Amino acid sequence: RRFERDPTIPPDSIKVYSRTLFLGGITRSVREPVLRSMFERFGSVQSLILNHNYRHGFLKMFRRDAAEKAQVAMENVPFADTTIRTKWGVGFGPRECSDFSTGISVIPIRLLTDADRTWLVTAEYGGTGGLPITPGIALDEPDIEIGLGISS
């Protein structure tokens, strides 16, 4: 797990490495079983949700380094009637803080909601690994959209 001291980011901030990829060019010829097989070459797929209504999907890898390998390999892949285009997505924190070129957010701690703070510290994958949020640390995207809890 990434819990790095990053004392050269701005004051009162954290740095979050996305594990979430945006998938563009998802026509109805591009199906979840085939994409899962393509991305499982790079590591374990935590989540993969296509929405053919928007010609897009979102993939979350268990590991940042597998998301990096996937994004570079799958950046532009001709496929059937389309081209699959893999770009950095954001699954955590303010979208406005997410560098869409690199999948790296630098977030002022004051902009983290209570849910965001609780997900960071309690996530199974990414986050702090059970330590408090302090400024000048770099970590991986936490798991989100779960109950606020420390018992379960």
Numbering used by the authors: 388 to 539
Quote the paper.
The long-wavelength beamline I23 at Diamond Light Source overcomes these limitations and extends the accessible wavelength range to λ = 5.9 Å. In this study, we report the determination of diverse protein structures by experimental phasing techniques carried out at long wavelengths on beamline I23 at Diamond Light Source using S, Ca, K, Cl, V, I, Cd, and P as anomalous scatterers. Native-SAD uses light atoms naturally occurring in proteins or bound to proteins. We demonstrate that long-wavelength native-SAD has become a very compelling technique, where a low multiplicity dataset from a single crystal can be sufficient for successful structure determination, making it a general vehicle of choice for experimental phasing.
To confirm the benefit of collecting at long wavelengths, we collected from Seb1-RRM crystals on beamline I23. A single dataset of 360° from a crystal diffracting to 1.8 Å was sufficient not only to solve the substructure but also to solve the structure without any phase extension, despite the low symmetry space group (C2), low overall completeness (65%) and the 27-fold lower multiplicity of only 6. This case clearly shows that data collection at longer wavelengths requires substantially reduced overall multiplicity. Solving a structure from a single crystal with low multiplicity is advantageous for multiple reasons: the number of crystals might be limited; crystals may not be isomorphous and cannot be merged or they may be especially susceptible to radiation damage.
